[PDB]
Tab-separated table of C-alpha atoms and ligand atoms in Angstrom:
chain	number	residue	atom	x	y	z
A	1	UNK	CA	82.405	94.080	102.984
A	2	UNK	CA	80.879	92.289	99.732
A	3	UNK	CA	81.636	92.551	95.872
A	4	UNK	CA	82.208	95.278	93.698
A	5	UNK	CA	79.469	97.201	92.327
A	6	UNK	CA	78.508	100.885	90.871
A	7	UNK	CA	78.610	101.890	94.283
A	8	UNK	CA	80.867	101.527	97.667
A	9	UNK	CA	80.903	102.319	100.979
A	10	UNK	CA	83.408	103.202	103.204
A	11	UNK	CA	83.189	102.531	107.171
A	12	UNK	CA	84.241	102.491	110.802
A	13	UNK	CA	86.056	105.025	112.981
A	14	UNK	CA	86.857	107.485	110.470
A	15	UNK	CA	83.387	108.214	109.161
A	16	UNK	CA	80.695	106.184	106.679
A	17	UNK	CA	81.152	107.809	102.634
A	18	UNK	CA	79.280	106.788	99.779
A	19	UNK	CA	80.990	106.509	96.629
A	20	UNK	CA	79.430	105.977	93.141
A	21	UNK	CA	80.030	105.899	89.515
A	22	UNK	CA	78.640	108.740	87.773
A	23	UNK	CA	76.647	107.465	84.346
A	24	UNK	CA	76.457	110.915	83.079
A	25	UNK	CA	80.005	111.187	83.838
A	26	UNK	CA	82.723	109.100	82.006
A	27	UNK	CA	82.510	106.689	84.607
A	28	UNK	CA	84.025	108.884	87.427
A	29	UNK	CA	83.905	108.330	90.577
A	30	UNK	CA	81.926	110.944	93.156
A	31	UNK	CA	81.413	110.537	97.246
A	32	UNK	CA	80.041	112.525	100.078
A	33	UNK	CA	79.828	111.335	103.549
A	34	UNK	CA	81.618	111.870	106.792
A	35	UNK	CA	84.464	109.611	106.043
A	36	UNK	CA	86.332	112.802	104.561
A	37	UNK	CA	89.276	111.189	103.584
A	38	UNK	CA	87.446	108.584	101.600
A	39	UNK	CA	85.530	111.769	99.541
A	40	UNK	CA	88.224	114.113	98.875
A	41	UNK	CA	91.081	111.752	98.154
A	42	UNK	CA	89.081	110.143	95.042
A	43	UNK	CA	90.593	110.496	91.752
A	44	UNK	CA	89.187	113.587	90.082
A	45	UNK	CA	88.989	112.322	86.681
A	46	UNK	CA	89.774	108.726	86.458
A	47	UNK	CA	87.476	106.394	85.190
A	48	UNK	CA	86.623	103.453	86.749
A	49	UNK	CA	84.549	100.343	86.239
A	50	UNK	CA	83.758	98.962	89.707
A	51	UNK	CA	83.863	100.372	93.631
A	52	UNK	CA	84.606	98.541	96.632
A	53	UNK	CA	85.187	99.813	100.131
A	54	UNK	CA	85.919	98.748	103.793
A	55	UNK	CA	87.168	100.265	107.104
A	56	UNK	CA	88.413	103.728	106.080
A	57	UNK	CA	89.131	103.244	102.787
A	58	UNK	CA	87.742	102.986	98.871
A	59	UNK	CA	89.149	100.930	96.058
A	60	UNK	CA	88.270	101.505	92.443
A	61	UNK	CA	89.227	99.087	89.405
A	62	UNK	CA	90.674	101.443	86.638
A	63	UNK	CA	88.981	101.296	83.208
A	64	UNK	CA	92.525	102.352	81.741
A	65	UNK	CA	94.786	99.995	83.042
A	66	UNK	CA	91.919	97.442	85.136
A	67	UNK	CA	94.046	98.190	88.231
A	68	UNK	CA	93.044	98.508	91.753
A	69	UNK	CA	92.908	102.109	92.906
A	70	UNK	CA	92.320	102.839	96.502
A	71	UNK	CA	91.898	106.017	98.207
A	72	UNK	CA	90.861	106.901	102.175
A	73	UNK	CA	92.653	106.545	104.916
A	74	UNK	CA	93.694	103.188	106.004
A	75	UNK	CA	96.997	102.301	107.222
A	76	UNK	CA	96.914	98.756	105.660
A	77	UNK	CA	95.828	99.847	102.271
A	78	UNK	CA	98.353	101.370	100.684
A	79	UNK	CA	97.026	104.718	98.494
A	80	UNK	CA	97.158	104.369	94.487
A	81	UNK	CA	98.040	101.902	92.960
A	82	UNK	CA	99.421	98.735	94.870
A	83	UNK	CA	102.501	96.806	93.337
A	84	UNK	CA	101.004	94.977	90.535
A	85	UNK	CA	103.196	95.327	87.636
A	86	UNK	CA	101.501	94.151	84.192
A	87	UNK	CA	98.748	92.157	85.764
A	88	UNK	CA	94.954	93.348	85.398
A	89	UNK	CA	92.186	91.751	87.105
A	90	UNK	CA	88.462	91.084	86.636
A	91	UNK	CA	87.311	92.438	90.230
A	92	UNK	CA	87.992	93.824	93.708
A	93	UNK	CA	86.559	92.969	96.746
A	94	UNK	CA	86.945	94.782	100.186
A	95	UNK	CA	87.558	93.716	104.047
A	96	UNK	CA	87.972	95.891	107.312
A	97	UNK	CA	91.576	95.944	106.701
A	98	UNK	CA	92.013	94.253	103.377
A	99	UNK	CA	91.456	94.364	99.476
A	100	UNK	CA	91.251	91.238	97.127
A	101	UNK	CA	92.212	91.425	93.508
A	102	UNK	CA	90.347	88.572	91.440
A	103	UNK	CA	93.384	88.621	88.071
A	104	UNK	CA	91.650	88.323	84.739
A	105	UNK	CA	92.119	85.258	82.748
A	106	UNK	CA	95.196	87.179	80.466
A	107	UNK	CA	96.782	87.323	83.827
A	108	UNK	CA	95.950	84.241	85.129
A	109	UNK	CA	98.745	81.093	85.132
A	110	UNK	CA	97.328	77.660	85.029
A	111	UNK	CA	97.633	76.073	88.866
A	112	UNK	CA	98.889	79.341	90.099
A	113	UNK	CA	97.064	81.883	92.206
A	114	UNK	CA	93.577	83.251	90.808
A	115	UNK	CA	93.835	86.170	93.593
A	116	UNK	CA	96.132	88.934	94.839
A	117	UNK	CA	95.300	90.356	98.279
A	118	UNK	CA	96.584	93.283	100.090
A	119	UNK	CA	95.989	94.385	103.981
A	120	UNK	CA	96.673	93.358	107.216
A	121	UNK	CA	97.004	89.062	107.704
A	122	UNK	CA	95.671	89.257	104.108
A	123	UNK	CA	99.178	90.372	101.758
A	124	UNK	CA	99.457	87.233	99.421
A	125	UNK	CA	98.488	85.513	96.856
A	126	UNK	CA	96.062	82.765	97.217
A	127	UNK	CA	93.655	80.152	95.562
A	128	UNK	CA	95.227	78.382	92.960
A	129	UNK	CA	92.489	77.750	91.109
A	130	UNK	CA	90.255	80.027	88.619
A	131	UNK	CA	87.201	82.065	90.117
A	132	UNK	CA	84.380	83.427	88.497
A	133	UNK	CA	83.762	86.244	91.616
A	134	UNK	CA	85.247	87.338	94.907
A	135	UNK	CA	83.534	89.098	98.058
A	136	UNK	CA	85.229	90.180	101.269
A	137	UNK	CA	84.182	89.712	104.618
A	138	UNK	CA	85.906	91.484	107.607
A	139	UNK	CA	88.821	89.268	108.035
A	140	UNK	CA	88.364	86.808	105.299
A	141	UNK	CA	87.887	86.743	101.299
A	142	UNK	CA	85.841	84.585	99.615
A	143	UNK	CA	85.318	83.123	95.800
A	144	UNK	CA	83.500	80.985	93.915
A	145	UNK	CA	85.193	78.408	91.830
A	146	UNK	CA	84.668	78.668	87.793
A	147	UNK	CA	84.672	74.909	87.569
A	148	UNK	CA	82.145	73.495	89.538
A	149	UNK	CA	80.476	76.725	90.956
A	150	UNK	CA	81.344	75.859	94.768
A	151	UNK	CA	82.616	78.342	97.436
A	152	UNK	CA	86.111	79.026	99.067
A	153	UNK	CA	87.241	81.575	101.538
A	154	UNK	CA	90.466	82.053	102.373
A	155	UNK	CA	92.161	84.346	105.341
A	156	UNK	CA	91.342	84.717	109.209
A	157	UNK	CA	88.460	82.486	110.249
A	158	UNK	CA	88.654	83.673	113.758
A	159	UNK	CA	84.851	84.135	115.060
A	160	UNK	CA	83.162	82.987	111.591
A	161	UNK	CA	84.209	79.508	110.816
A	162	UNK	CA	83.310	80.630	106.878
A	163	UNK	CA	86.657	78.869	106.082
A	164	UNK	CA	86.173	74.775	106.933
A	165	UNK	CA	82.021	75.376	107.495
A	166	UNK	CA	81.884	76.999	103.781
A	167	UNK	CA	79.195	74.445	101.965
A	168	UNK	CA	81.570	72.452	99.577
A	169	UNK	CA	79.468	70.903	97.045
A	170	UNK	CA	76.379	73.592	96.899
A	171	UNK	CA	76.832	75.365	93.854
A	172	UNK	CA	76.178	79.479	93.711
A	173	UNK	CA	74.644	81.954	91.060
A	174	UNK	CA	76.337	84.525	93.448
A	175	UNK	CA	78.027	85.435	96.999
A	176	UNK	CA	78.202	88.235	99.438
A	177	UNK	CA	80.389	88.107	102.343
A	178	UNK	CA	79.362	89.857	105.569
A	179	UNK	CA	81.454	90.584	108.701
A	180	UNK	CA	81.380	86.606	109.749
A	181	UNK	CA	79.093	84.868	107.688
A	182	UNK	CA	78.488	84.457	104.182
A	183	UNK	CA	74.936	84.175	102.007
A	184	UNK	CA	74.667	83.126	98.492
A	185	UNK	CA	71.994	82.551	95.691
A	186	UNK	CA	72.324	78.886	94.443
A	187	UNK	CA	72.250	78.134	91.097
A	188	UNK	CA	69.430	75.649	90.952
A	189	UNK	CA	66.147	77.148	92.353
A	190	UNK	CA	67.692	80.540	93.428
A	191	UNK	CA	67.531	79.724	96.881
A	192	UNK	CA	69.092	81.799	100.102
A	193	UNK	CA	71.842	79.889	102.189
A	194	UNK	CA	74.431	81.384	104.132
A	195	UNK	CA	77.023	80.035	106.568
A	196	UNK	CA	79.150	80.958	109.560
A	197	UNK	CA	78.698	81.237	112.846
A	198	UNK	CA	76.846	84.675	113.081
A	199	UNK	CA	74.123	86.271	114.904
A	200	UNK	CA	72.571	87.200	111.434
A	201	UNK	CA	71.964	83.407	110.642
A	202	UNK	CA	70.138	83.361	114.186
A	203	UNK	CA	66.681	83.723	112.729
A	204	UNK	CA	67.584	81.996	109.318
A	205	UNK	CA	66.967	82.969	105.703
A	206	UNK	CA	63.347	84.587	105.042
A	207	UNK	CA	60.902	81.618	104.019
A	208	UNK	CA	59.822	81.980	100.398
A	209	UNK	CA	62.642	84.725	98.978
A	210	UNK	CA	64.024	84.469	96.146
A	211	UNK	CA	66.543	87.367	95.043
A	212	UNK	CA	68.681	88.573	92.739
A	213	UNK	CA	71.517	90.546	94.343
A	214	UNK	CA	72.651	90.066	98.122
A	215	UNK	CA	74.734	92.164	100.379
A	216	UNK	CA	75.301	91.926	103.904
A	217	UNK	CA	76.337	94.374	107.439
A	218	UNK	CA	78.793	92.855	110.143
A	219	UNK	CA	75.554	90.783	111.575
A	220	UNK	CA	72.956	91.837	109.383
A	221	UNK	CA	71.580	90.594	105.252
A	222	UNK	CA	69.510	92.184	103.009
A	223	UNK	CA	68.309	90.827	99.273
A	224	UNK	CA	66.780	92.678	96.642
A	225	UNK	CA	63.317	90.599	95.305
A	226	UNK	CA	63.720	88.959	91.829
A	227	UNK	CA	60.275	90.641	90.466
A	228	UNK	CA	59.875	93.460	92.691
A	229	UNK	CA	63.448	94.600	93.294
A	230	UNK	CA	62.906	96.016	96.887
A	231	UNK	CA	65.236	95.403	99.483
A	232	UNK	CA	64.039	92.724	102.589
A	233	UNK	CA	66.795	93.161	105.091
A	234	UNK	CA	67.131	90.644	108.119
A	235	UNK	CA	70.323	89.929	110.874
A	236	UNK	CA	70.922	90.592	114.583
A	237	UNK	CA	70.062	94.084	116.217
A	238	UNK	CA	68.204	94.868	112.921
A	239	UNK	CA	65.075	97.508	113.308
A	240	UNK	CA	61.730	96.822	111.589
A	244	UNK	CA	64.121	99.150	104.656
A	245	UNK	CA	62.483	101.515	102.995
A	246	UNK	CA	59.381	99.183	101.294
A	247	UNK	CA	58.707	101.623	98.539
A	248	UNK	CA	61.454	102.716	96.704
A	249	UNK	CA	63.049	99.719	94.305
A	250	UNK	CA	66.714	99.627	93.985
A	251	UNK	CA	68.984	98.291	90.761
A	252	UNK	CA	72.063	97.662	93.338
A	253	UNK	CA	72.671	97.589	97.259
A	254	UNK	CA	75.885	98.021	99.029
A	255	UNK	CA	75.987	97.276	102.667
A	256	UNK	CA	78.575	99.269	105.272
A	257	UNK	CA	79.274	97.773	108.812
A	258	UNK	CA	76.069	98.770	110.184
A	259	UNK	CA	74.263	100.437	107.395
A	260	UNK	CA	73.317	99.818	103.872
A	261	UNK	CA	72.527	101.840	100.861
A	262	UNK	CA	70.929	101.126	97.172
A	263	UNK	CA	71.325	102.953	93.900
A	264	UNK	CA	67.642	103.380	92.843
A	265	UNK	CA	66.166	101.419	89.916
A	266	UNK	CA	65.301	105.158	88.612
A	267	UNK	CA	67.995	107.136	87.752
A	268	UNK	CA	66.300	110.028	88.158
A	269	UNK	CA	66.007	109.339	91.778
A	270	UNK	CA	69.015	109.834	94.541
A	271	UNK	CA	70.385	107.332	96.659
A	272	UNK	CA	69.086	106.222	99.721
A	273	UNK	CA	70.697	104.972	102.998
A	274	UNK	CA	69.343	103.266	106.204
A	275	UNK	CA	71.031	102.065	109.223
A	276	UNK	CA	70.740	98.210	109.851
A	277	UNK	CA	71.883	97.917	113.310
A	278	UNK	CA	74.498	98.743	116.023
A	279	UNK	CA	76.851	97.010	118.052
A	280	UNK	CA	77.281	95.333	121.547
A	281	UNK	CA	79.097	93.734	123.948
A	282	UNK	CA	78.708	89.826	123.645
A	283	UNK	CA	80.222	87.158	125.899
A	284	UNK	CA	83.182	86.118	124.666
A	285	UNK	CA	85.796	83.174	126.527
A	286	UNK	CA	88.133	85.690	127.754
A	287	UNK	CA	84.493	87.514	128.801
A	288	UNK	CA	82.349	84.863	129.753
A	289	UNK	CA	79.671	87.367	131.860
A	290	UNK	CA	78.253	86.592	134.913
A	291	UNK	CA	75.889	83.895	135.880
A	292	UNK	CA	73.222	85.040	138.395
A	293	UNK	CA	69.326	83.906	139.259
A	294	UNK	CA	68.864	87.509	140.397
A	295	UNK	CA	68.610	90.438	138.309
A	296	UNK	CA	71.088	91.978	136.888
A	297	UNK	CA	73.385	94.684	138.885
A	298	UNK	CA	73.839	98.279	137.541
A	299	UNK	CA	75.937	98.543	134.613
A	300	UNK	CA	75.372	94.951	133.164
A	301	UNK	CA	71.973	93.634	131.425
A	302	UNK	CA	70.648	90.287	131.062
A	303	UNK	CA	71.281	88.552	127.318
A	304	UNK	CA	68.119	87.380	125.855
A	305	UNK	CA	67.723	83.827	125.946
A	306	UNK	CA	67.150	83.733	121.506
A	307	UNK	CA	70.908	84.649	121.574
A	308	UNK	CA	71.961	82.960	124.344
A	309	UNK	CA	70.844	79.551	123.206
A	310	UNK	CA	72.539	80.939	119.724
A	311	UNK	CA	75.949	81.398	121.114
A	312	UNK	CA	75.876	78.151	123.245
A	313	UNK	CA	78.068	74.960	121.786
A	314	UNK	CA	76.387	72.068	120.035
A	315	UNK	CA	74.756	70.062	122.837
A	316	UNK	CA	75.566	72.362	125.843
A	317	UNK	CA	74.108	75.309	127.873
A	318	UNK	CA	76.154	78.766	128.794
A	319	UNK	CA	75.307	78.902	132.114
A	320	UNK	CA	74.784	75.835	134.416
A	321	UNK	CA	71.530	76.195	135.214
A	322	UNK	CA	69.276	77.302	132.066
A	323	UNK	CA	67.345	79.226	133.886
A	324	UNK	CA	69.636	81.712	135.540
A	325	UNK	CA	70.353	85.159	133.832
A	326	UNK	CA	73.889	85.888	131.935
A	327	UNK	CA	74.773	89.576	132.666
A	328	UNK	CA	77.111	91.445	130.289
A	329	UNK	CA	78.743	94.196	130.440
A	330	UNK	CA	77.146	97.584	129.238
A	331	UNK	CA	78.642	99.072	126.123
A	332	UNK	CA	80.337	101.833	126.949
A	333	UNK	CA	79.863	104.706	123.987
A	334	UNK	CA	78.855	104.282	120.212
A	335	UNK	CA	81.082	104.274	117.298
A	336	UNK	CA	81.628	107.143	115.223
A	337	UNK	CA	79.313	108.770	113.908
A	338	UNK	CA	76.482	107.163	116.239
A	339	UNK	CA	75.044	107.913	119.441
A	340	UNK	CA	73.346	106.647	122.093
A	341	UNK	CA	69.298	106.725	121.522
A	342	UNK	CA	68.548	104.427	124.284
A	343	UNK	CA	70.433	103.746	127.866
A	344	UNK	CA	71.400	100.499	128.900
A	345	UNK	CA	68.551	98.529	130.726
A	346	UNK	CA	68.571	95.224	132.783
A	347	UNK	CA	67.452	93.286	129.695
A	348	UNK	CA	69.116	94.825	126.849
A	349	UNK	CA	72.946	96.797	126.208
A	350	UNK	CA	72.509	100.305	125.363
A	351	UNK	CA	71.490	101.322	121.733
A	352	UNK	CA	73.022	103.281	119.057
A	353	UNK	CA	71.690	105.377	116.031
A	354	UNK	CA	73.594	107.391	113.494
A	355	UNK	CA	73.824	111.393	114.618
A	356	UNK	CA	71.788	113.079	111.689
A	357	UNK	CA	71.030	116.458	114.000
A	358	UNK	CA	73.814	118.106	112.574
A	359	UNK	CA	73.538	117.726	108.926
A	360	UNK	CA	73.154	121.376	107.956
A	361	UNK	CA	74.380	123.334	104.687
A	362	UNK	CA	78.277	122.600	104.039
A	363	UNK	CA	77.985	120.094	107.250
A	364	UNK	CA	79.039	116.414	105.415
A	365	UNK	CA	77.706	114.359	108.006
A	366	UNK	CA	77.407	110.336	107.672
A	367	UNK	CA	76.249	108.694	104.783
A	368	UNK	CA	73.845	106.765	106.095
A	369	UNK	CA	71.452	109.835	107.137
A	370	UNK	CA	70.626	110.806	103.011
A	371	UNK	CA	66.919	109.813	102.748
A	372	UNK	CA	64.753	112.205	99.766
B	1	LIG	C1	86.040	72.643	92.658
B	1	LIG	O1	86.996	72.979	91.903
B	1	LIG	C2	88.272	73.385	92.751
B	1	LIG	C3	89.494	73.746	91.320
B	1	LIG	O2	89.321	72.952	90.417
B	1	LIG	C4	88.505	72.195	93.497
B	1	LIG	O3	90.024	72.501	94.282
B	1	LIG	C5	90.663	71.422	94.108
B	1	LIG	O4	90.312	70.651	94.363
B	1	LIG	C6	91.934	69.413	94.109
B	1	LIG	C7	91.436	68.002	94.645
B	1	LIG	O5	90.709	67.545	95.980
B	1	LIG	C8	92.801	70.052	95.206
B	1	LIG	O6	93.792	68.829	94.796
B	1	LIG	C9	93.178	70.937	95.117
B	1	LIG	O7	94.056	71.556	95.841
B	1	LIG	C10	92.132	72.411	94.769
B	1	LIG	N1	92.712	73.625	95.066
B	1	LIG	C11	92.332	74.433	95.460
B	1	LIG	C12	92.751	76.050	95.148
B	1	LIG	O8	91.846	74.339	96.687
B	1	LIG	C13	87.593	71.802	94.515
B	1	LIG	O9	87.838	70.965	95.201
B	1	LIG	C14	86.547	71.451	93.386
B	1	LIG	N2	85.164	70.771	94.298
B	1	LIG	C15	83.964	70.345	94.023
B	1	LIG	C16	83.168	70.178	94.859
B	1	LIG	O10	84.158	69.883	92.837
B	2	LIG	C1	95.997	85.930	111.156
B	2	LIG	O1	95.444	84.873	110.529
B	2	LIG	C2	94.993	83.444	110.991
B	2	LIG	C3	94.337	82.609	110.060
B	2	LIG	O2	95.070	81.952	109.737
B	2	LIG	C4	94.460	80.699	109.249
B	2	LIG	O3	93.597	79.506	109.754
B	2	LIG	C5	95.078	78.887	111.045
B	2	LIG	C6	94.400	78.462	112.113
B	2	LIG	C7	96.244	78.436	110.192
B	2	LIG	O4	95.522	77.236	109.757
B	2	LIG	C8	96.323	78.831	108.987
B	2	LIG	O5	97.472	77.950	108.254
B	2	LIG	C9	95.313	79.656	108.068
B	2	LIG	O6	95.834	80.256	107.598
B	2	LIG	C10	94.437	83.612	112.161
B	2	LIG	O7	95.007	82.174	112.684
B	2	LIG	C11	95.601	84.469	113.233
B	2	LIG	O8	95.161	84.679	114.335
B	2	LIG	C12	95.861	85.788	112.323
B	2	LIG	N1	96.574	86.401	113.345
B	2	LIG	C13	96.259	87.862	113.483
B	2	LIG	C14	97.553	88.487	114.043
B	2	LIG	O9	95.075	88.563	113.680
B	3	NAG	C1	82.921	93.999	133.456
B	3	NAG	O1	84.805	93.972	133.148
B	3	NAG	C2	85.116	93.905	133.851
B	3	NAG	C3	86.880	94.287	133.730
B	3	NAG	O2	86.991	94.489	132.705
B	3	NAG	C4	85.416	92.573	134.083
B	3	NAG	O3	86.352	92.365	135.657
B	3	NAG	C5	84.166	91.775	134.621
B	3	NAG	O4	84.006	90.768	134.827
B	3	NAG	C6	82.862	92.335	133.529
B	3	NAG	N1	81.598	92.052	133.789
B	3	NAG	C7	80.710	91.113	133.170
B	3	NAG	C8	79.321	91.061	134.029
B	3	NAG	O5	81.149	90.720	132.347
């Protein structure tokens, strides 16, 4: 998820691993976490200028050749350097199951593709116009035009709406993509604007917040304040960020966020930013009932019901009725059930940091001072 930076995180079923460019070394990457493939597969002496991560893989932009070099255990992302030839790339961005690479000016041809992408349902060349930056969602990638600074997205739009609902006309300084939404900092005034049919935008942007950079998970978004350089995170199923430590940059996994401290002496910190819950779909609509929800199901809160309800329509015929959704069975890799499924909420998951002894190699989301 997100864009290229000095730090990156892999996430998903294979574990959670934080990779960072060591400035004390020759811009060589060093990783740690539960995604063992993304730790020990890292190139041991390949100088890199940037990093980006996805579901079980991390890709770096080489210094020498300025081409993508990927490692990890994602079946849709090839290990090593993809079939590029002579092209060179300005930036990288990794989604769940795909990598996108913004071509350098020297490798760009007029009226031709600006981005090369590899991955599931994403392998090909895209936007036929120069872009400044690129960012990747779960199943899509976005970018800002060099001409008018307006955003454009490509890929699978299902569940997000980020391609058609893109604010073509607003000019952005930078944009970051979450799992099903995109947030950006406006060029004029540096306000934060987001789009995409996601519960990460259920409450909206924190009032009066000016950020320098943004990162986003599946259903959450974090930002660094302009002055204090302190993190401010919001979104779905988010618990009440480290308030003390200022950061120079952030990076977001699917359900955790890591930050490179502004002070180079202090080590990296990571914290959980939520957990997945079963939500009603077209195929699994959920039971509208006037009575409390039966065992094994929970009453979806009225706030999210209104958010998931179409324009000018109620989700259940009788608005007072409870919408009962099946309780989630289990937690994703690295997390364990912290709270049981009640009649009012789904089961809550937290990252299992109990097996973090010496030479245990636990999740990257468990690293605090
Ligand atoms: C911003 O600039 C881009 C690139 O110059 C524009 O994208 C092109 O717009 C023309 C005119 O509609 C289309 O014929 C092309 O197919 C577009 N190219 C691509 C790759 O999509 C974009 O329309 C401009 N937007 C604004 C608001 O100025
Ligand atoms: C692969 O991604 C597709 C996205 O395609 C885009 O949206 C559709 C509606 C068309 O306008 C197409 O030209 C666009 O490129 C998804 O529609 C499709 O379901 C995805 N397939 C799988 C197997 O995930
Ligand atoms: C729970 O799942 C079963 C089987 O997948 C389905 O038939 C049922 O409708 C679901 N219950 C609710 C309340 O959605």
